[PDB]
Amino acid sequence: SGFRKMAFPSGKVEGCMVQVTCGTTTLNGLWLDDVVYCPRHVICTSEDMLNPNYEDLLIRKSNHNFLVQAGNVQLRVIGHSMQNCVLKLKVDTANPKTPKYKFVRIQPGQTFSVLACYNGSPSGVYQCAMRPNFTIKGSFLNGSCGSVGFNIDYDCVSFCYMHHMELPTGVHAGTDLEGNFYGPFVDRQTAQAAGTDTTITVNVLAWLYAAVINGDRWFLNRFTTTLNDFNLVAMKYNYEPLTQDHVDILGPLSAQTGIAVLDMCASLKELLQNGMNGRTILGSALLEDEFTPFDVVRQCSGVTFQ
Amino acid sequence: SGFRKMAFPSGKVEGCMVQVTCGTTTLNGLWLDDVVYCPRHVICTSEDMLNPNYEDLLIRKSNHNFLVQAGNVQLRVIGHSMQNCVLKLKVDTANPKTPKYKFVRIQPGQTFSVLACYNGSPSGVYQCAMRPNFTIKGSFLNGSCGSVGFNIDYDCVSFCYMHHMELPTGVHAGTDLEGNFYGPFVDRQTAQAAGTDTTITVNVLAWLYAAVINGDRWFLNRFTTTLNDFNLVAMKYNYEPLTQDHVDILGPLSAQTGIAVLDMCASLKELLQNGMNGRTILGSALLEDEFTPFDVVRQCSGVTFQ
Ligand SMILES: *[C@H](O)[C@@H](C[C@@H]1CCNC1=O)NC(=O)[C@H](CC(C)C)NC(=O)OCc1cccc(F)c1
Ligand SMILES: *[C@H](O)[C@H](C[C@@H]1CCNC1=O)NC(=O)[C@H](CC(C)C)NC(=O)OCc1cccc(F)c1
Q1: A149: phi then psi, degrees, rounded to nearest 5
Q2: Separation of alpha carbons A35 and A182, rounded Å
Q3: In angstroms, rounded to a whole number, what is the distance separating the alpha carbons of residues B297 and B306?
Q4: Which of B142, B162, B169 to mutate to test the pocket of ligand 1 (most atoms within 8 A of CB)?
Q5: A49: which of A101, A175, B91, B191 lies 20 to 30 Å off by Cα?
Q6: Beta partners for A143?
Q7: What is the CATH number that goes with domain B201-299?
Q8: How far is CA A177 from CA A13, A82, A150, A153, in A?
Q9: Which of A177, A175, A176 is nearest to A185 (CA)?
Q10: Which CATH number fits domain B11-91: 1.10.510.10, 2.40.128.630, 2.40.10.10, 3.20.20.70?
């Protein structure tokens, strides 16, 4: 038993990380087949680049302007292109460690594993959720750009994030692997801010289900509420609305515990209006919303990824 | 910026995990060079679990009774010895993916990454702290025994933990890689319980320093304290005593922030007395104690946000 925030094993991704290093700027790249993907802002910017023309900068560059290092090894770049905010560098060598992979775009509320890297060397791994305001609460320092987020599906790696920047509130923003930002952000060093965050209601409910399963029950009551009644409580406490689909995917957990989903929602008011009243749930004094319903099921069962 | 519980990249350990099976019982093993290490209770019959004489069980086994599988490959066992509660199986094949590694025994308060595995296949990775009562608060299901905890320090893998059992309160216990349990526990299904846990004070202070490095100061105060006065108050909140060694180890973090350790202790005293008053520190409404001073220095930058 037990419930822990748990990243996917990172070995399949560690073998794809490289250092991409142009001019004075160093960041990480993702080496798949004979292409290295990295954030486009690696391109030697103006000096002054109040507003960089990435299209025009890339035309001024040759192949060897880009130094790519794989472990201690130099990779020969033979072509370079851009797709949205990602720079695609062709290399002469296919990565022999390339896993089965697909590029996917993730929805807010869904989670993925982050492999933080520096100078092309993996440094750590942790789980993040795509917030409703399209930021993630991560841990990134200078040189971490190009770190990627992913999920593993048996043996298929679904890459879903590149890392790009940090917002003034200390949270983080990035793109999918096709170079499309999550959220209303741009890759310029200008005034940017995250919208007011909301709480992922369906994940909170899943986490409460995980709590009852592991023995925590003080917050339950015999009351219920209709879907409409709850949503007005959520809208006051800055929570995502709860849809009939959300209730549906929570079905399995309702069976395991014998609480109807709306019958759990009655608890959630209680937590929202009154609070936890000096108590804790799964070792937290807050309501946690970065465990998806599947994350909970992936945890009560043992799903491995050979 | 940002602060997260961050595991080490698990790739170096993923390549060492295998499946070991004796009769009807299956668990994970650690394959390094031509030896596979796994918990000795894999030999146990069902028939008895309370008082097995493992020496007697093992003498009755031959090499081919042990089935070792690395992915799709069966490994042939050519020798077997027992060291405390760990079984060492010699194999005819050295693991070619074997890293630089060391076996270490960690002290309470130390942290490590756990690679949860099932049927020899990695399932997830997460950070754990050796609690003062010699348990870890993990996530383990049936079949997870043989999963290991580790740290990586310059491509050297320090193995410090092998999982054996779950205690009645939902926490977990295991051994070092030499087979000696952490704590007064034994690998039989008898009446066992963890001692009362305490809070790892030096880790809490490290985490408070981490908060300051990341720009947060609301919890500081204008006071200082003597080491003894702090410990007399802390023990009243069920906190581990703080030793001069702990104060010395906090030196670097105190230098980076310009907060004296005893001034940070003054803050913690006030936090224990007051609570969070609806506030959070690094996104938690509780005082977190599973980040060591080293964990903080590894993750934060060396430039604080003054
Ligand atoms: C073995 O893989 C692992 C499984 C435990 C029990 C469930 N979650 C775990 O981490 N350890 C054991 O099965 C040990 C083996 C002993 C002989 C050392 N047995 C055990 O922990 O029994 C207690 C127990 C508690 C909860 C649930 C359960 F199935 C067993
Ligand atoms: C890439 O390596 C870097 C990662 C950032 C840096 C510090 N934490 C991160 O996540 N990205 C950038 O530096 C980014 C590049 C521009 C072209 C988009 N700019 C940026 O993040 O500026 C905001 C910032 C805030 C605090 C500290 C900092 F260095 C930068």
Answers
A1: -110, 150
A2: 23
A3: 17
A4: B142
A5: A175
A6: none
A7: 1.10.1840.10
A8: 14, 12, 10, 17
A9: A175
A10: 2.40.10.10
CA nearest to B38, candidates B119, B157, B139, B141: B119
Distance of CA B57 to the CA centre of its chain: 30
Query: Resolution (in Å) of the shown entry?
Result: 2.0
Tokens standing for residue B169: 């309160």
Cα(A305)–Cα(B119) distance, rounded to whole angstroms? 11
Q: What angle (nearest 5°) sits at the alpha carbon of residue A49, between those of residues A48 and A55? A: 145
Radius of gyration of chain A (CA): 22
Q: Provide the pairing of β-strand B17-22 with A172-175.
A: unpaired
| Residues in chain B, overall count | 306
Where in chain A does DSSP place strands (E)?
A: 17-22, 25-32, 35-39, 67-70, 73-75, 77-83, 86-91, 101-103, 111-118, 121-129, 148-153, 156-166, 172-175
| Cβ burial, residue A188 (10 Å; 0-12/13-18/19+) | middle
Q: Is B28 helix (H, G, I), strand (E, B) or coil?
A: strand
Burial class (CB in 10 A: 0-12, 13-18, 19+), B23: middle
B165 ligand 1 Cβ < 6 A: yes
Contact A295, A202 (CB under 8 A): no
Q: Where are the alpha helices (DSSP H) in chain A?
A: 11-14, 54-60, 201-213, 227-236, 244-249, 251-257, 261-273, 293-300
Interchain proximity A286–B276, CB inside 8 Å: no
- Work out the minimum CA distance from A111 to partner chain B, whole angstroms: 14
Residue type for position A156:
C
C-alpha neighbours within 13 Å on the C-beta side of residue B286: 15
Distance from CA of B3 to the nearest CA of A (A): 5
**B209 vs B287: CA distance, rounded Å:** 12
Class of domain A12-91: mainly beta
How many helices, marked H, and strands, marked E, lie in chain B?
Answer: 8, 13
Cβ contacts of B184 within 8 Å, gap of 6 or more: B134
**Mutate which of A45, A166, A169, A171 for ligand 2 pocket (most atoms within 8 A of beta carbon):** A166
- Alpha helices (H) along chain B: 11-14, 54-59, 201-213, 227-234, 244-249, 251-257, 261-274, 293-299
Looking up tokens 């990775």 gives B125
Distance in angstroms (rounded) separating the CA atoms of residues A3 and A127? 14
d(CA A164, CA A187) in angstroms, rounded, equals: 7
Encoded amino acid at B30, one letter: L
How far CA B195 is from CA of A182, B177, B192, B238, in Å, comes to 47, 23, 10, 13
Phi then psi for B26, rounded to 5 degrees?
A: -125, 135
The answer to whether A115 contacts B3, with C-beta atoms less than 8 Å apart, is: no
Q: How far apart are CA B293 and CA B273, in angstroms?
A: 24
Provide the β-strand partners of residue A29: A18
